[PDB]
Amino acid sequence: GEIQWMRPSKEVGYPIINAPSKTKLEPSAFHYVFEGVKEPAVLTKNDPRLKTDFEEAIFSKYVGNKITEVDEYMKEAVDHYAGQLMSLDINTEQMCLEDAMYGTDGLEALDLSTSAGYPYVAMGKKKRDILNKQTRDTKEMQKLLDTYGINLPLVTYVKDELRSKTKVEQGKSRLIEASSLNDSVAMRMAFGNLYAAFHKNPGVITGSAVGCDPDLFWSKIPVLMEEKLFAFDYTGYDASLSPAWFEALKMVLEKIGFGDRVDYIDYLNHSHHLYKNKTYCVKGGMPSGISGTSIFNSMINNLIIRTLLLKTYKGIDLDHLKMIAYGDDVIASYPHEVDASLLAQSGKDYGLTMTPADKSATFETVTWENVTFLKRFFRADEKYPFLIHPVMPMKEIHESIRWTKDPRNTQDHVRSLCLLAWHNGEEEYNKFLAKIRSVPIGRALDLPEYSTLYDRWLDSF
């Protein structure tokens, strides 16, 4: 991903986009009951905590483009992945506007809280004014489609979230590229059934885990993996994607019956953005945030891993490559041990910056004991080993509970954390509940006890 140019939006006929400048995150009733070191991300150039230029920091993610064309390994990767997907008999017909808007089997309805993007954001027109979830009305939307069409600019927002001290001082805040409601709708109409087919088939065939339920899915993963596991993290995955990777994705889509609408991928690859009073053009880089983002990042990941294995290990049997991606996150396996370090090396030549799994300093062997997926470990249940617990460490949960974005969602926020934490065991869970109940706010919450969550878990399979 590389920014071609950037300039005042007025110079190209666009209005200044108003974005919030004050975080919605404030210390919660548990701020001093639990240990934590993260704070709200810098949202503006004037943030006192900054120790470097903000604008420069937030756009530096666009490391550039390392490859122009789709090489022979990539083509091979494309044929193999496309072949697997073929086995799912994915419905290739476009999805009607009604479902693309209000959802259907395998596809949730459009999120009414998220941005409507340009130009609605500049006309103060919200989604709540465009769609009727109880009416399933598509006339207003249809009229808007006909009026403003598609391929509209994406609106760049700084993500309001918790970040480490270092990242705050270095202005390393993450960005959200909200596509226009029109594009989101047109895209869900074009790829709606693909999205659904993926949501309904999380696994090693789609090579995707998007739409999955960790509590149930974790028990299916081990059975799908080959003997030897391997993994690694990416640095700035989305932004590092070169145009070739988008072209490789289009080839996959063509081969599975969607060659009919690969043009929509161009909108993602070569895209223009609106940020504050500026407008810029980017070549490459996946717009982090758009409808389809995680699924397409996941598909491209399947292409990347395959490409690197072909490039590094001629004769590798991709039919025994068992991997599951969630955007840039990935858990993979092969009957034989592979060198993540070597793969990482091959990765550089493809514009990908790969590093040791889970922030390690060196590339160590990945095992069922130390592997994580979506920040969760895998732990067989003590009483019924065939049931696998997705275990997220208490550290991130402690960090999260120390802040709130709205006092009205305190019980939902805390219940949410409880569904994640109890998997760490009863001793830990009870310690967690006790601290919560050491302050008034917590004692007033309705939280499930351990045995209740355990029973609920067993009854969910």
The candidate with the shortest Cα–Cα distance to 432, out of 379, 393, 385, is 393
Is 260 annotated as ligand-binding? no
Least Å distance, CB 61 to Na ion, is: 12
Judged by beta carbon, residue 190 or residue 282, the one nearer Na ion is 282
The candidate with the shortest Cα–Cα distance to 54, out of 161, 174, 143, is 174
CB burial of 208-228 (b: ≥16 within 10 Å; e: otherwise) equals bbbbbebbebbbebeeebbee
Judged by beta carbon, residue 271 or residue 333, the one nearer Na ion is 271
Is 233 annotated as ligand-binding? yes
Q: Which residue is nearest to Na ion (CB)?
A: 271
Q: List residues near Na ion by CB under 5 A.
A: 271, 282, 285
Q: In what order do the strands lie in the sheet with 278-283?
A: 2-8, 278-283, 270-275, 154-158, 175-178
Judged by beta carbon, residue 179 or residue 346, the one nearer Na ion is 179
Judged by beta carbon, residue 289 or residue 442, the one nearer Na ion is 289
The candidate with the shortest Cα–Cα distance to 257, out of 443, 2, 125, 85, is 85
Distance CA 349, CA 352 (A): 7
Judged by beta carbon, residue 70 or residue 282, the one nearer Na ion is 282
Task: Find out whether 111 and 293 touch, Cβ atoms under 8 Å.
Answer: no
Distance CA 268, CA 245 (A): 11
* Residue 271, strand partner residues: 282
Least Å distance, CB 309 to Na ion, is: 26
Backbone angles phi, psi at 163, to 5 degrees: -140, 160
Judged by beta carbon, residue 75 or residue 272, the one nearer Na ion is 272
Least Å distance, CB 263 to Na ion, is: 14
Task: Find out whether 106 and 199 touch, Cβ atoms under 8 Å.
Answer: yes
Q: Where are the beta strands (DSSP E) in 52-119?
A: none
Least Å distance, CB 173 to Na ion, is: 19
Least Å distance, CB 349 to Na ion, is: 21
Cα angle value 214/35/378 (rounded, 5°): 25
Judged by beta carbon, residue 155 or residue 282, the one nearer Na ion is 282
> How long, in residues, is the chain?
461
Least Å distance, CB 348 to Na ion, is: 21
Judged by beta carbon, residue 50 or residue 281, the one nearer Na ion is 281
Least Å distance, CB 46 to Na ion, is: 28
Least Å distance, CB 267 to Na ion, is: 9
Q: In what order do the strands lie in the sheet with 322-326?
A: 228-230, 329-334, 322-326
The candidate with the shortest Cα–Cα distance to 159, out of 238, 223, 270, 228, is 238
Binding annotation: 233, 328
Binding annotation for Mg(2+): 233, 328
